[PDB]
Amino acid sequence: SGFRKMAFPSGKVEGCMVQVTCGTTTLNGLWLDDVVYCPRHVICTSEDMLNPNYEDLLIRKSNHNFLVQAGNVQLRVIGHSMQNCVLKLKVDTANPKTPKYKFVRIQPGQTFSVLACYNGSPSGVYQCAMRPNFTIKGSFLNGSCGSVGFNIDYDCVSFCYMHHMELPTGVHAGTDLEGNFYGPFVDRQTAQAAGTDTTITVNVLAWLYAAVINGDRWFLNRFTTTLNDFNLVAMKYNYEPLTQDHVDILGPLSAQTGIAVLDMCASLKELLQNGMNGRTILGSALLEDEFTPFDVVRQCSGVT
Amino acid sequence: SGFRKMAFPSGKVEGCMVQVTCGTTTLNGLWLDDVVYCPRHVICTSEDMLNPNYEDLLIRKSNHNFLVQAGNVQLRVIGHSMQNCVLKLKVDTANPKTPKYKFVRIQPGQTFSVLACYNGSPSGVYQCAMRPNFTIKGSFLNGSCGSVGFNIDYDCVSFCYMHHMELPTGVHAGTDLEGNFYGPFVDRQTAQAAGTDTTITVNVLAWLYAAVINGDRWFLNRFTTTLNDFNLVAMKYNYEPLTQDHVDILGPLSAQTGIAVLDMCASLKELLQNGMNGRTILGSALLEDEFTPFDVVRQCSGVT
Ligand SMILES: *CC(=O)N[C@@H](C)c1cccc2ccccc12
Ligand SMILES: *CC(=O)N[C@@H](C)c1cccc2ccccc12
């Protein structure tokens, strides 16, 4: 029993982290096979960052200007290319610790683990969600760029995020591993405001199911609702609309607990309208939205 | 910027996890050098667990009754002993992935990372604290016994916890790696109630400092207090007494923020008396007590 904000074991990703230095900028790279992936802004001076022309800046860079260090051993860079907002540094050595992997572009509301790194060395691991406004709420100091977000399916690491930017509001923006930003963000030090950070409704519902499975049941009420009625209340509270697709995804948790999804919606509706009245659910005083239905099943079943 | 409940990177510990089977019970072992450490209750039938005599039960067990599997390879058990509530299985092979390590017995209020494992395979990593009542609030299904808690200092893993028991209230009890339970708990399926789960005051204060460092400042007020005045309020709210030793430990966060520890106590005092009034601090609606002052410094500075 018990339910924790749980990250994937980070070992398979730790084995992929390297240090990338271009001039006086050091950040993190991801070494898979004979390619090191890193933010293209590794090439920028802080002056460059205000209005960088990455193609023009890259012309001044040779393979030997990219210093790649794996532990205390230097890797030889034999090629470099820009793909969207990432650099791909071809090295002469395949990472011997390369796990089975995929690059995936996640949807808002999807959760993943971040391995926060500085100088190619892992400092910590935590669980994130892609926010509906395509930011993440991370923990990233200077030097943490190139840190990655991932999911694991048994032995296959799906890489979904690479850290690029902190917005003036202290929320985070980055790319998939093809170098495409999540959301409208750019690797330029300019006015970039996030949109509404709405609550991931399907995730809250999943977590309420987790609560029931772990004995926290005080919020279960006598009511039901419809998707349309619930959605009127959701909209008023800056919750994402719930779709039949979300209802379908929650079916297994419905089945396990015997609580109809729309009944749990009606419980969530009363929590929104009434508040927590100083009570907690799984040790939280707010409704947690960084567990997916898949996460809740995984943790309640014990997948490895 | 940003502040997350962050675990240590788990790779060094993943390399130590094995499966231990005695009869029809499978749980986790920790393989360091040529010793596999596991809960002694691996030898019990569920009938045994009601009133186990571990010395008597152990007489019926030989080295060959302990099946130890590291990945899909069997380890040869050449000796076994009981130390308090752990078994030490001597194997003929040193773990080639043994990291630098120590066994440490932590104090209440100290935080650590748990690598939740099933069948010797890692499922997830999360951050815990030793509660003042010597329980932890974990995420542990059947099969998770022998999962470990640890801290890392650069490259030395300090092992502080091994999972043994879930109490009827769904909180967790376990041992250090010398097999001594935290608190008054025993590896017997009997009436074991936890004491008062008080809030770790020095940890809340550390986290309020983290909040100020990351721009969450709304709770800072015009007041100060004394340790004695604060402690009157703490006692009323089931917070641990704050000692001068705690004040000394918070000095570096005091220095960095320029907020006197007793001023931050007076802010915490007003939050206890007034509540959050529906506001959040670092995305929490309750005062977080599972960050130590050391954790806050580490994460705000970026140690690897
Ligand atoms: C996130 C990161 O590690 N890289 C960027 C933000 C960075 C770090 C340190 C100095 C510097 C100077 C000029 C531009 C960018 C950076
Ligand atoms: C925690 C754990 O993995 N071991 C214990 C609780 C256990 C698991 C599964 C079956 C069983 C049967 C009898 C006693 C103990 C167990």
Closest CA–CA distance from residue B56 to any residue of chain A (Å): 30
Pairing mode of beta strands B156-166, B100-103: parallel
Q: Which residues pair with A47 in a beta bridge?
A: none
Cβ-contact B145, B20 below 8 angstroms: no
Q: Which fold has domain B1-14+100-197?
A: Thrombin, subunit H (2.40.10)
C-alpha to C-alpha distance for B286 and B239, rounded to whole angstroms: 13
Resolution, rounded to a tenth of an Å?
Answer: 1.5
Longest dimension (CA), chain A: 68
* CA-angle at B289, arms to B284 and B295, nearest 5°: 100
Which residues have a Cβ under 8 Å from the Cβ of A218 and sit 6 or more positions away? A279, A281
Given a contact cutoff of 8 angstroms between Cβ atoms, the answer to whether B204 and B289 are in contact is yes
Please give the DSSP secondary-structure letter assigned to residue A291. Answer: -
The dihedral formed by the CA atoms of B130, B136, B138 and B142, expressed in degrees to the nearest 10: 130
Residue in A14, A128, A215 closest to B11 by CB: A14
Query: How far does residue A130's CA lie from ligand 1's centre (Å)?
Result: 23
CA–CA dist A132, A147 (Å, integer): 21
The C-alpha atoms of residue A78 and residue A60 are separated, in whole angstroms, by 16
Give chain B's largest Cα–Cα span. Answer: 68
CATH topology identical between B1-14+100-197 and B198-301: no
Q: Is A138 on the interface with B (CB under 8 A)?
A: yes
Q: How many CB pairs under 8 A join A and B?
A: 159
In whole angstroms, give the CA distance from residue B189 to residue B89: 24
What is the CATH class of A198-301? mainly alpha
Q: Does B233 touch chain A (CB under 8 A)?
A: no
| Contact in structure between B70 and B58 (CB atoms under 8 Å) | no
Euclidean distance between CA atoms A137 and B3, whole angstroms: 9
Task: Give, in words, the CATH class of A15-99.
Answer: mainly beta
Cβ <8 Å between B304 and A166: no
* Residue whose token pair is 């970026």: B302
Q: Is B142 touching ligand 2 by the criterion CB < 6 Å?
A: yes
The torsion angles phi and psi of B78, rounded to 5 degrees, stand at -110, 0
Residue whose CA lies nearest to ligand 1 atom number 6: A142
Q: Mutual orientation of helices A201-213 and A244-257 as an angle, nearest 10°?
A: 0
**CA separation for the pair A113, A101 (Å, rounded):** 15
Strands B17-22 and B66-70: antiparallel
| CB B44 less than 6 A from any atom of ligand 2 | yes
If one residue of B46, B140, B162 were mutated to test the ligand 2 pocket, choosing by the most ligand atoms within 8 A of its CB, it would be B46
| Ligand 2 atom 13: residue of nearest CA | B46
Tokens found for residue A42 = 């590794």
The H or E element containing residue A91 is strand A86-91
Assess contact for A38 and A90: CB atoms under 8 A: no
B171 contacts A2? CB cut-off 8 A: yes
The SS3 of residue A247 is: helix
Chain B residues whose CB is inside 8 A of the A171 CB are 2
Q: Tokens in use for A272? A: 């929104």
The residues, any chain, with a CB within 8 Å of residue B77's CB and separated by 6 or more, are B36, B63, B64, B66, B68, B89, B90, B91
Alpha carbons A18 and A27: distance in angstroms, whole number: 9
Q: How far apart are CA B126 and CA A255, in angstroms?
A: 28
Q: How far is B84 from chain A (nearest CA, A)?
A: 25
The pair of three-digit structure tokens given for residue A198, joined into one six-digit string: 């709405």
Is A116 an interface residue toward B (CB < 8 Å)?
Answer: yes
Do the Cβ atoms of B285 and A283 come within 8 Å? Answer: no
Residue in the structure block whose two tokens are 């419809």? A226
Q: Which H, E and C letters describe chain B, residue by residue?
A: CCCCCCECCCHHHHCCEEEEEECCEEEEEEEECCEEEEEHHHHCCCCHHHCCCHHHHHHCCCHHHEEEEECCEEECEEEEEEECCEEEEEECCCCCCCCEEEECCCCCCCEEEEEEEECCEEEEEEEEECCCCCCECCCCCCCCCCCEEEEEECCEEEEEEEEEEECCCCCEEEECCCCCECCCCCCCCCCCCCCCCCECHHHHHHHHHHHHHCCCCCCCCCCCCCHHHHHHHHHHCCECCCCHHHHHHHHHHHHHHCCCHHHHHHHHHHHHHHCCCCCCECCECCCCCCCCHHHHHHHHHCCC
Q: If you ran DSSP here, which 8-state letter would residue A145 be given?
A: T
C-alpha closest to that of A137 among A196, A184, A197: A197
Contacts of A284 in chain B (CB under 8 A): 284-286
Residues of B in contact with A143 (CB under 8 A): 302
Which chain B residues are closer than 8 Å to A10 by Cβ?
9-11, 125
How far, in Å, from the CA of B203 to the mean position of ligand 2?
33
Name the β-bridge partners of A161: A149
Q: What is the rounded CA–CA span in Å between residue B110 and residue B288?
A: 13
Q: Which of B123, B275, B286 sits opposite A302 (nearest CB)?
A: B123
The full 3-state SS of A21-79, as one line of letters, equals EECCEEEEEEEECCEEEEEHHHHCCCCHHHCCCHHHHHHCCCHHHEEEEECCEEECEEE
Contact by Cβ (8 Å): B266, B222: no
- Ligand 2, pocket-test mutation among B25, B49, B140, most atoms within 8 A of CB: B25
Q: Please check whether residue A304 is in contact with residue B122, taking contact to mean a CB–CB distance below 8 angstroms.
A: yes
Where are chain B's structural domains?
1-14+100-197, 15-99, 198-301
For tokens 């690029």, the residue is: A164
Q: Quote the CA–CA distance of B102 and B110 in Å, as a whole number.
A: 16
| Contact criterion met (CB < 8 Å) for B124 and A166 | no
Tell me which residue of B144, B137, B142, B99 sits closest to B123, measured CA to CA: B144
Distance CA B71, CA B185 (A): 32
C-alpha separations of B258 from A18, A80, B110, B264 in Å: 36, 46, 25, 10
What are φ and ψ of residue A197, in 5° steps?
-85, 85
Count the alpha carbons within 13 Å of A141 in the hemisphere toward its beta carbon: 18
Q: In this structure, are residues B35 and B91 in contact, taking their beta carbons and an 8 Å threshold? A: yes
Phi, psi of A124 (to 5 degrees): -170, 165
Please state, in angstroms and rounded to a whole number, the distance separating the CA atoms of residues B147 and A99.
Answer: 24
Question: How many other C-beta atoms can be found within 10 angstroms of the C-beta atom of residue A249?
Answer: 18
Structure tokens at B220: 């800072």
User: What's the sign of the alpha-carbon dihedral A81, A87, A92, A96?
Assistant: negative
Q: What is the DSSP string of A165-216?
A: EE-TTS-EEEE-TTSPBSTT--SSSS--------B-HHHHHHHHHHHHHTT-
Q: Which residues contact A157 (CB under 8 A, 6 or more apart)?
A: A12, A13, A99, A100, A101, A102, A150, A151
Q: Any CB–CB contact under 8 A between A238 and chain B?
A: no
Burial class (CB in 10 A: 0-12, 13-18, 19+), A292: buried
Strand ordering across the sheet containing B25-32: B73-75, B66-70, B17-22, B25-32, B35-39, B86-91, B77-83
Atom of ligand 2 nearest to the CA of B140: 1
CB contact under 8 A, B1 and A115: no
Query: From CA A101, how far away is CA A104, in angstroms rounded?
Result: 10
Cα–Cα dist A263/A86, whole Å: 45
Q: Which residues of A form the catalytic set? A: 41, 145
Strand partners, A103: A159
- Of A9, A299, A300, nearest to B10 by CB-CB distance is A9
Q: Give residues 8 to 37 of B whose Cβ lies within 8 Å of A.
A: 8-12, 14-15
In sequence order, the 6+-apart residues with CB closer than 8 A to the CB of B298 are A123
Residue with tokens 């045994």: B48
Name B214's Cβ contacts closer than 8 Å, sequence gap at least 6. A170, B1, B2, B3, B282
3-class SS of residue A269 = helix
Distance of alpha carbon B184 from the chain centroid: 16
For residues A160-189, one letter each, b for 16 or more C-beta atoms within 10 angstroms of the residue's C-beta and e for the rest, the string is bbbbbbbeeeebbbbbbbebebbbebebbb
